[PDB]
């Protein structure tokens, strides 16, 4: 259930954590490979930079 919310007016984008929280694009994450397989294009565009 990793859903992504865009920022607004300078607020940073956030991604949905397993415990139920939303965290910004920073730090140490754990992914199974199925996540990147399901969302190849979207995740590439959002994360690569």
């Amino acid at each position: 259930d990793c859903r992504i919310s865009f920022g607004m007016n300078g607020a940073a984008p956030m991604i949905r954590d397993e415990t139920g929280l939303m965290v910004p694009f920073e730090g140490n994450w754990i992914f199974p490979l199925a996540l990147w397989q399901m969302n190849t294009r979207y995740f590439n565009q959002q994360f690569d930079a």
């Binding site: 190849t40 294009r41 979207y42 565009q45």
Partner: protein, 140 residues
């Protein structure tokens, strides 16, 4: 060392002795040739029945025919082969139209796959479409 081929494709003092003269005259009963030919015909192994089994990529091998129709068709074919073998027009020993009501009999065919569904469309095609439904492309 001698190389052995493959029949199947891979992944790509006086010499004279007293009693040795050969003037014996005997004919066999039964004769050697007759029994030899009969035994040669009996040596043959059974045919491989691969109908209804997978291919090397998952598709089923056979023809798209109903199973009971398949059994009756095979009985007719075997009876015709019997008539051919005894040289008669009509076979004396028959596998069809025997007086037994054998109407529930089933035979293998290409009309079903391993999970119990129909082969109206090959399995590889179904895999391809189910996969194509989930593809995504570069952003506009």
């Amino acid at each position: 060392m001698k190389r052995i081929p493959r029949k199947t494709k891979g992944k790509s003092p006086a010499t004279t002795e007293p009693g040795t003269s050969n003037r014996e005259q005997y004919k066999a009963r039964p004769g050697i040739a007759s029994v030899q030919r009969a035994t040669e015909s009996a040596e043959m192994p059974m045919k491989n029945n691969d109908e209804g089994t997978p291919d090397k990529k998952g598709n089923t091998k056979g023809d798209l025919v109903n199973e009971h129709s398949e059994a009756k068709d095979e009985a007719d074919e075997a009876t015709k082969k019997q008539a051919k073998d005894t040289d008669k027009s009509k076979a004396q020993v028959t596998y069809s139209d025997t007086g037994i009501n054998n109407a529930n009999e089933l035979s293998r065919s290409g009309n079903v796959d391993n999970e119990g569904g129909s082969n109206q469309k090959p399995m590889s095609t179904r895999i391809a479409e189910a996969t194509s439904a989930i593809v995504s492309k570069h952003p506009a």
